[PDB]
Amino acid sequence: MKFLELNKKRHATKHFTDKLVDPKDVRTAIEIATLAPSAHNSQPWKFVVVREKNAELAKLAYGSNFEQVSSAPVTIALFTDTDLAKRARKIARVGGANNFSEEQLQYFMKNLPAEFARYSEQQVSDYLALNAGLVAMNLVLALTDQGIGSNIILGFDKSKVNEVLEIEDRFRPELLITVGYTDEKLEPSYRLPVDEIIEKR
Amino acid sequence: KFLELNKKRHATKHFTDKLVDPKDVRTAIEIATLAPSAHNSQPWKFVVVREKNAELAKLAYGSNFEQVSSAPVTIALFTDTDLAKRARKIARVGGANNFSEEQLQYFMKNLPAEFARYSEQQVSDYLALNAGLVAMNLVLALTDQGIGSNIILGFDKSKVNEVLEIEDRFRPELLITVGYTDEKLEPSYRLPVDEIIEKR
Ligand SMILES: Cc1cc2nc3c(=O)[nH]c(=O)nc-3n(C[C@H](O)[C@H](O)[C@H](O)COP(=O)(O)O)c2cc1C
Numbered sequence: 057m058k059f060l061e062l063n064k065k066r067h068a069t070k071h072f073t074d075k076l077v078d079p080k081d082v083r084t085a086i087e088i089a090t091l092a093p094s095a096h097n098s099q100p101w102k103f104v105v106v107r108e109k110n111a112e113l114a115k116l117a118y119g120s121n122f123e124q125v126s127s128a129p130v131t132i133a134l135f136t137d138t139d140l141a142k143r144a145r146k147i148a149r150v151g152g153a154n155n156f157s158e159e160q161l162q163y164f165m166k167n168l169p170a171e172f173a174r175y176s177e178q179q180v181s182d183y184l185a186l187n188a189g190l191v192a193m194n195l196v197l198a199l200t201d202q203g204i205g206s207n208i209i210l211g212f213d214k215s216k217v218n219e220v221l222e223i224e225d226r227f228r229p230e231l232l233i234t235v236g237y238t239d240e241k242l243e244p245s246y247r248l249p250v251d252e253i254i255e256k257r
Numbered sequence: 258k259f260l261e262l263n264k265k266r267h268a269t270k271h272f273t274d275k276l277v278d279p280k281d282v283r284t285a286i287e288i289a290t291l292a293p294s295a296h297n298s299q300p301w302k303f304v305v306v307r308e309k310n311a312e313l314a315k316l317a318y319g320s321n322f323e324q325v326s327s328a329p330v331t332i333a334l335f336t337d338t339d340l341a342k343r344a345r346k347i348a349r350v351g352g353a354n355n356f357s358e359e360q361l362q363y364f365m366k367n368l369p370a371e372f373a374r375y376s377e378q379q380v381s382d383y384l385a386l387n388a389g390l391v392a393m394n395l396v397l398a399l400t401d402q403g404i405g406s407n408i409i410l411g412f413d414k415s416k417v418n419e420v421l422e423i424e425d426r427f428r429p430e431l432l433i434t435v436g437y438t439d440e441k442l443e444p445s446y447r448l449p450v451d452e453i454i455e456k457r
C-alpha cells in the first residue's frame with residue numbers, strides 16, 4: 057500500500073537542482089535511519105555529513121561519480137566501526153544503566169566483545185558491510201519520504217577517504233550517499249520478475 | 258509516515274498461530290526487491306522455507322533455534338557469488354524489451370569485466386552490503402503488511418545449502434523469520450543521533 061508508494065518514488069538520483077538541503081532534514085533522516093536493526097543491536101555506523109569538503113571528496117570518486125559528488129549539495133559518507141569490541145563497549149557506556157540491566161551491560165562490555173574476537177577477517181568484513189546495507193536502505197527511504205533525492209555510490213577510492221574527511225582509521229568508509237533535490241524525471245530501473253528470484257522449500 | 262512504519266518494526270521472537278498467506282510473502286518480496294543494488298546487479302535469491310523449517314532450525318545457534326522452529330515462515334536470503342553470471346542473467350531475462358543496445362552490452366560485457374577485477378574480499382563485501390539493502394526493505398515491507406520479522410545472523414552458513422537444497426553458487430546471508438507477533442515489544446536502544454554524526 058503506502059510503503060510500495062515510498063519505494064516507487066526512490067530513484068538513483070544523478071543530477072541535482074540548486075535547492076538547498078536543510079541540515080534539520082538531514083539530521084532527521086539519519087535519526088529515522090538508525091532505527092534500523094543491526095546484528096546484536098551493535099549499530100556499528102558513523103554518518104559523516106559533508107557540506108564543506110565536497111570538492112575534495114569528489115576527487116576520490118570514479119567516472120561520473122566525480123560530477124555527482126561535486127554537484128550534490130550534501131554527501132553523507134557512511135563509515136562502519138572496524139573495532140567491534142569498542143563498538144559493543146560504546147553502546148554500554150553511552151546507554152548505561154538507564155537503558156540496560158546489569159546483565160545487558162556485561163553482555164556489551166564483556167560477552168559480546170569476546171564473541172567478536174573470534175570472528176575471521178571475512179566474518180568481520182561481511183558483518184560491517186551487511187549492517188551498512190541495512191542502514192543505508194533506511195536512510196535513502198527516510199530522505200525519499202521527505203521529498204529528497206539521493207544516490208548510493210560505491211565507486212570511489214576508499215583508501216583516501218579517512219584522510220580527506222579527517223576521520224579516525226578505526227572507521228572504514230562503506231558508501232557515499234549523495235543528497236539533493238532531483239533535476240530530472242526518472243523512470244524505474246529494471247528488476248527481475250519476482251518468481252525468478254524466489255525458491256520454495 | 259515512514260517514521261511511524263519504522264516505530265512498528267521490532268525484532269520479533271515469539272509468534273502467534275495465525276497463518277502467513279503465501280501471497281503476502283510474495284508481495285513483500287516483490288516490494289523488497291525494488292531496493293537499489295550496486296550496478297542494479299540485484300544479486301539476491303529469496304528461499305521461502307515452509308516445509309524444511311525443523312531441519313533449518315538445527316543450524317541456528319542458541320536462542321535462534323527456537324525462533325526458526327517456531328516461525329511459521331523463514332526466508333533464507335542468499336546472494337549470487339557468480340556476479341558475471343548474475344550480470345548476464347539480468348541481460349538475458351530483461352532483454353531488448355527492457356534494455357537498449359548499450360545497456361545490454363554493459364550487462365553482458367562491461368560489468369563481468371569489472372567484476373573480474375574485484376579481490377575476494379571486495380566480492381564478499383559487495384554481496385553482504387547488497388543483502389543488507391534488500392533485507393532492510395523486506396523487513397519494512399512485511400511490517401507495512403502487519404507482519405512481524407526478525408533477522409538472524411547466528412547460524413551455521415556451511416550447511417544451509419545442503420539442508421535447503423540450494424546450489425553452492427548462492428551463499429546464505431541471513432535467515433529472516435516471518436510471522437505475526439504474540440507480545441508487546443518495546444523499541445531496543447539506539448545511540449543518540451548526535452553521537453553517530455560528524456560534520457565535514
Ligand atoms: C544482521 C542482523 C543479525 C541478527 N542476528 C540475530 C541473531 O542471530 N539472533 C537473534 O536473536 N536476533 C538477531 N537479530 C536481531 C537483532 O538483535 C535486533 O534487530 C537488534 O537487537 C535491534 O533491535 P530491533 O530490531 O528491535 O530494532 C539480528 C539483526 C540483524 C539486523
Ligand SMILES: Cc1cc2nc3c(=O)[nH]c(=O)nc-3n(C[C@H](O)[C@H](O)[C@H](O)COP(=O)(O)O)c2cc1C
Pocket residue numbers: 066067068069120121207208209210211212244245291292293294295296297298386387390
Ligand atoms: C550499493 C550500491 C552501489 C552503487 N554504486 C554506484 C556507483 O558507483 N555509481 C553510480 O553512478 N551509481 C551507483 N549506485 C546506483 C545504482 O546504479 C542504482 O542504485 C541501481 O541501478 C538501481 O537503480 P534505482 O535505484 O534507480 O532503482 C549504487 C547503488 C547501490 C545501492
